[PDB]
Symmetry: C3
């Protein structure tokens, strides 16, 4: 049930009706691959086995050389620049540091001796879920040891290339990613293995249901950290998202520049709401994501990460209805740049048409059905297939939903251009007023 | 025929002589893969077939689970922040919504019964080109049904792994991309299939010739949208670029900070043209791409996307010759940051040398051939292989082309530092003048 | 030996003790693959060979069509916007332009006739290291020519698919990357081939030791440029990083907003150091990388690229101890945005808590151990596992290292809010003072 409201006064539109799925924590699991510890015959079948065995030996050496250092990563030091700075794999690397302590790998090696899935409590007190997805030790020792110059058939050559291929592909991913990959591919964790991992995960039924129906999103929000390879065990930590906030209301705020509508070049002043992005109710406050491109939207579900959010008071919503309200200082930016553009919303299109720009909305069967005059306007996606602003053609989202046009006078008309602070990049309503008050008194 | 002109007055250079190739629209095609609808024997050849058949069954289940939701995507809400906001796959998803209407898949399934390529007119009136690239139904039913515990040979095991591998790789791409991939890989569409798709495409001969000679660029500007999988048919929409603007003049404007040349720290004022990027003539106006990194340049051809552009009047070119012209208010930024840097142009290098920085240009055989003094200067790529500014070594483009040094006094000398607005991030020539006029009157 | 110091006065922390590894130049090598120049029988083994041979012929045609144009690339025109603009593959493309000169490929073809590794001096005077990694000519001519309708076995079908697979994968990478790939995958250059290339490279023993122990980082800083395919030779240039600066001191400066601590909404003023990023001593100056995410950190080693750096005087370090020092004008930004956030450092966490935000630091075994009051504070990673600011949970880095809390009064208390320039995006200490001095005199 997606609806949309356009606010003509502030040149902004809100698309509400979405449900939340916020990454609040991390789950660390240890995926393992049991390894094997290892002829004059020129047999064309043994030669193919010797070649595949060298690929196995090189991949093990390649991963050992890769891990002689700590898991490498890159970290930092409209309003996205106001965000904090985290360490995404800090939790996964912490689990990996524990696996280097002596005897810790033996605990994992022993727990997975009789089964392939087991919960292990590490030395530092963390209870991780362990998973042995490939047992190359069992295959090489039971099917490739008696052959080494002995009897060889082609069905073993094919089967060994099939099982070893997963190890080769995992090494290829880590070799070009410095031991940290995201999203987590199907070589690191197949769709059946990941689903089985989610089912055995200590989470609520709603979290299992949510993650199982969106495994492709879980992959995109998961990390695979190459960890340790000792004592015939190849272990890499898979860091999975914890969705501590589920099914709370979300809405996407779209904003576009609001300018005066003089055809004369350079005689206009503008005003743009800078608080655009995804908003979701979260624990009394509002989780504001200033860069909506960091969130994934599956149907009416919104997948975001709280690391890319700010925690704002719920009074920030008043900027949609009353941008001049005294409870919250609404963030805006001021510019003299009267350029034309359009913002494709969930159920329509905002059109900021200025200067001498041709702005239209068209249907594919009929052609132009509306011609926008100068100013900031809006059209619903019902009956409209494309929007053109200048030489840019926009396709609108053809999703079902009702739009509401909230009429109101553009607030840019309430400012005297002679004393309007034309170049404020990160300002607010009160901030602009303060500058206007000073410029007035001195006149 | 690439030429270049450096404007000493404004610390900017224009590289002209390029030809346009602008993405103006989209073409949606439906690529299909016909699927098959499906033993005590422990035969080492049947066992390999059973394993590959499970890979086939899992990939189908994995793609069915992936598509139970609408095609997921991420969208927004120097001057790149002035751009609009579109929905890249809005047109492709619209085609996919039609394929879910009942009987629509049967139209595609029937049209591709006797051939592999066919044009189908959908129910909503859109005429799409359909393509059956893989018929696993025909292979499993004619070569793998009588075997199921029957006679098995190794040549069938190898051939089934070859044909099924494309389905497995397509699933791997969609599993780590949430059903939307770009660029379109060769598993989604081989080079011969894409070229055949371009040839059967309803476009002019110039568009066919352009796309065929730059298929790698077309891939980078194309989307692959996993759509529907029902009634033994696996369909995904390939969204291809429409180049409605071809062979119009383009030019790249490079800008660098222009500062006063006092060695004393912090006593300088700067000025930087913010209108840098790719410019292309387009339908009476000028398509300005403020982030030149969004365009691909093959030889003298420039591939851009109008979604990443602004539509400006052609008078914006006057800022290169006369930044003070009254017809267009040229965009600049003002700073006190007198740091040294270089901008590698198409046929040379702009050098902004300030403070106590060592700035040189060298030849690989001889060494330093020029030492830059403080200010903004330029050197041609003829005879010059590298440029050094501080501890940063720049390699220059060794492309053939003539450069022109347009002498002129730096416009930063025309401003009195005592009343110069030192911190304007998104300003213009007129905007700075306005602020100077006010500060003067109050003195 | 990583240590950290937090500066309460300026809301910033420095993590020192790292060692440098700066990309200062490029090394260009020519990797080659010798190609072969090429039946009514329906044999199920010849049919599999005919199919794999068509994959070989199509890949060669696909790469020939890809290279009919010059190697395509995309280039430009907190303080990262102050950086210069280079051409990353300018040096590699220059080597490729030489390979198109007639007779140049024959020099490479002749040098690799009796060996697989050879140093060749090109016509323009550049001495490149050449490497023949795959000889498909020798395999097709000696193992697949007598078969073409003749005797065929399955071991040849498997071996031809193995050798040809590397050519097919290299083509797949170039087809979706327009002939330029980074990082350099293991198909372009295997781990053993790259290590052998580093060993035969004309570099010092320290550079060989550094690159060999961090091959995954070298891959991420290397380019693979598809170059020429003529006269049975497929050549692509691998552009490798030259680390001209090794083992010099580095340190990472983390900054966070410093605001006044009034609970009242919108009554605070802030101040944020904008000079955050990686700093490394380099040749008398300091290489400043304003976007720390461009550097890779392996253990205590920092891998950066001087193309993403500014060359600053060493006096910039005084901003950590005395932001008001007269030797360097420290860069800051001023805002009224009193939002709460945290910055995860190497050995702790900076917490900027403002408004009505809940900011805590917790241990996994015990829970909340510290509750932050309004202002900018810091906690060490010793005994602390997580930090919460609002609805955002941060995991801290669990690396061993001592932190030092340098007490001092926040410099934001030294400003009178009535005359404080609230919206300076790219300002400095002196710049703010200048604006304050003017606003005072007019009062």
């Amino acid at each position: 049930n997606i609806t949309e409201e356009f606010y003509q006064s502030t040149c902004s539109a809100v698309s509400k009706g979405y449900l939340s799925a916020l990454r609040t924590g991390w789950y660390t699991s240890v995926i393992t691959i049991e390894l094997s510890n290892i002829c004059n015959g020129t047999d064309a079948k043994v030669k193919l086995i010797k070649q595949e065995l060298d690929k196995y030996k090189n991949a093990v050496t390649e991963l050992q050389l890769l891990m002689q250092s700590t898991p490498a990563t890159n970290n930092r030091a409209f309003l996205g620049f106001l965000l904090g700075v985290g360490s995404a794999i800090a939790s996964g690397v912490a689990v990996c540091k524990v696996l280097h302590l002596e005897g810790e790998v033996n605990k994992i090696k022993s727990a997975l001796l009789s089964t392939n899935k087991a919960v292990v409590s590490l030395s530092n007190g963390v209870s991780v879920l362990t998973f042995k997805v490939l047992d190359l030790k069992n295959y090489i020792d039971k099917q490739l040891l008696p052959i080494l110059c002995s009897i060889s058939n082609i069905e073993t050559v094919i089967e060994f290339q099939q099982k070893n291929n997963r190890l080769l592909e995992i090494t290829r991913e880590f070799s070009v990613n410095a031991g940290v990959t995201t999203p987590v591919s199907t070589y690191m964790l197949t769709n059946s293995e990941l689903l089985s991992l989610i089912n055995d995960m200590p989470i609520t039924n709603d979290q299992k249901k949510l993650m199982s129906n969106n495994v492709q999103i879980v992959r995109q929000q998961s990390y695979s950290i190459m960890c340790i390879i000792k004592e015939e065990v190849l272990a890499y930590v898979v860091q999975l998202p914890l969705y501590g906030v589920i099914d709370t209301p979300c809405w996407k705020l779209h904003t576009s520049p609001l300018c005066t509508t003089n055809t004369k070049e350079g005689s206009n002043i503008c005003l743009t709401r800078t608080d655009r992005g995804w908003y979701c109710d979260n624990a009394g406050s509002v989780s504001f994501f200033p860069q909506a491109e960091t969130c994934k939207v599956q149907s009416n579900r919104v997948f975001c990460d709280t690391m890319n959010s700010l925690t704002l008071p719920s009074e920030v919503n008043l900027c949609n209805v009353d941008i001049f309200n005294p409870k919250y200082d609404c963030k805006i930016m001021t510019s003299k740049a009267d350029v034309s553009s359009s913002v494709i919303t969930s159920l329509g299109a905002i059109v900021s048409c200025y200067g001498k720009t041709k702005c239209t909305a068209s249907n594919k069967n009929r052609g132009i059905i509306k011609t926008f005059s100068n100013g900031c306007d809006y059209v619903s996606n019902k009956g409209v297939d494309t929007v053109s602003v200048g030489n840019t053609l926009y396709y609108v989202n053809k999703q079902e939903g009702k739009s509401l046009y909230v009429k109101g006078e553009p607030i840019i008309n309430f400012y005297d251009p002679l004393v309007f602070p034309s170049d404020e990049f990160d300002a607010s309503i009160s901030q602009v007023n303060e500058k206007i008050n000073q410029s007035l008194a001195f006149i």
